[PDB]
A and B are shown apart, each in its own frame.
Chain A
Amino acid sequence: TTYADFIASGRTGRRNAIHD
């Protein structure tokens, strides 16, 4: 399930901002 792939993905923590 998409929910599961998200939970198993390395992107569930606080996401850092980017610019450079």
Chain B
Amino acid sequence: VKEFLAKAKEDFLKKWENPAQNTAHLDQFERIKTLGTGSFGRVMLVKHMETGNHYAMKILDKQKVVKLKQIEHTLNEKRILQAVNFPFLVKLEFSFKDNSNLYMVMEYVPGGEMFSHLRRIGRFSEPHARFYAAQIVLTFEYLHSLDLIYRDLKPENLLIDQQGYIQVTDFGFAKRVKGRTWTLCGTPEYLAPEIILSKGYNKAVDWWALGVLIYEMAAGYPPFFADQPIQIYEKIVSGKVRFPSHFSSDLKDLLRNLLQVDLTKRFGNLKDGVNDIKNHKWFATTDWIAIYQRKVEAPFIPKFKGPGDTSNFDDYEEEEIRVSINEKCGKEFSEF
């Protein structure tokens, strides 16, 4: 580990200090279908004509990034993804820009979101969940080893590849930080007590989000939910959590320390950090090197009818991409 991260940290720092830009153009890909939309961009299934490959292209409306005050965040995402390298992180193949947009072309993961299978299946058996948690746990050791905080863990951001392993998407809040940070960001159900309380926080929030993940994965529902965000925040800071009857004793214990309101008593952010997690009972059967190597038998393999297939993604209204004749936000996105 300490040996692994060492090398890893050095390759990231090189790209970090020398990010690559303009490695492709829009005309080299074939726009085929929208797979996800949102606030200021959308992801499209695209086809690279020269290699005949399929990729997930993330298109950011520059003016929209600006009105939502997400400039620095967007720069964070691209700069960080062009430099990280781990098996549970989707790869940033190309990144470029034109008059109106920012583009991040990455590997296409046809398996679909963990969210869909989860909601469709209802809830995962503990083993199947631990197999996913483990992957998040390792990936978080990687990111954190590099001073990165992820900040948006949740089923929606987890894709399942062919081998059945996790692929983390969306680094819109990923940030390289040594020290406290104060940006309020994330998704309601997963917010840490610290964040909601606007009290300056650290990596400990990713570990809390992990606790929420494991629980939803294993309960079928979130540990804190209500129809309105404020309602949800009241449960989050309450320091109270209930667990289904099927939850194993160990799982309740591992979770009691993960969802620890007091971040000076929360697993992950202790003197042993990660290990307090990796050496936990619920994980006692986990073979980490095995998991990091993908040699572990996957709980379930997604059904893919082939490359370019999108039957594991919901449909979405289409819209023609438009690039104005004039540059829209030159200076703001200069380094992208």
Q: Is the CB of A3 within 8 A of B220?
A: yes
Complex Cα–Cα for A20 and B186 (A): 11
- Report, as a range, how many residues of chain B touch the other chain: 20 to 34
Complex Cα–Cα for A10 and B226 (A): 8
B188 at the interface (CB under 8 A from A): yes
Residues of chain B within 8 A of A17, CB atoms compared: 39, 152, 172-173, 185-187
From A9, A10, A15, A19, B183 is in contact (CB under 8 Å) with A19
Q: Is the CB of B227 within 8 A of A9?
A: yes
Residues of chain A within 8 A of B219, CB atoms compared: 2
User: Would you call the interface of chain B mostly helix, strand, loop, or mixed?
Assistant: loop
Q: Mark A1-20, 1 if CB is under 8 A from B, else 0.
A: 01100100111101111111
From B115, B152, B186, B227, A10 is in contact (CB under 8 Å) with B227
Residue in chain B with minimal CB distance to A15: B187
Residues of chain B within 8 A of A12, CB atoms compared: 119
Residue in chain A with minimal CB distance to B227: A10
Complex Cα–Cα for A19 and B54 (A): 32
Q: Is the CB of B69 within 8 A of A18?
A: no
From A6, A9, A14, A20, B220 is in contact (CB under 8 Å) with A6
Q: Is the CB of A14 within 8 A of B115?
A: yes
Residues of chain A within 8 A of B161, CB atoms compared: none
Interface centre among A2, A9, A16 (most CB of B within 10 A): A2
B283 at the interface (CB under 8 A from A): no
Interface centre among A3, A6, A9, A14 (most CB of B within 10 A): A14
Residue in chain B with minimal CB distance to A7: B221
Interface centre among A2, A10, A19, A20 (most CB of B within 10 A): A19
B164 at the interface (CB under 8 A from A): no
From B69, B156, B188, B226, A20 is in contact (CB under 8 Å) with B69
Residues of chain A within 8 A of B187, CB atoms compared: 15-18
Complex Cα–Cα for A19 and B152 (A): 11
Residues of chain B within 8 A of A6, CB atoms compared: 220-222, 225
Whole-angstrom distance from the CB of B129 to the nearest CB of chain A? 16
A3-B220, A6-B222, A9-B226 given; name 10 further pairs at CB < 8 Å. Answer: A2-B242, A6-B220, A6-B221, A6-B225, A12-B119, A15-B154, A15-B188, A16-B38, A17-B39, A19-B186
Question: Would you list 20 pairs from A and B whose C-beta atoms are within 8 A, ordered by A residue?
Answer: A2-B242, A6-B220, A6-B221, A6-B225, A9-B226, A9-B227, A10-B227, A11-B189, A11-B226, A14-B115, A14-B156, A15-B154, A17-B39, A17-B173, A17-B186, A18-B188, A19-B70, A19-B183, A19-B184, A19-B185
Q: Which residues of A contact B (CB under 8 A)?
A: 2-3, 6, 9-12, 14-20
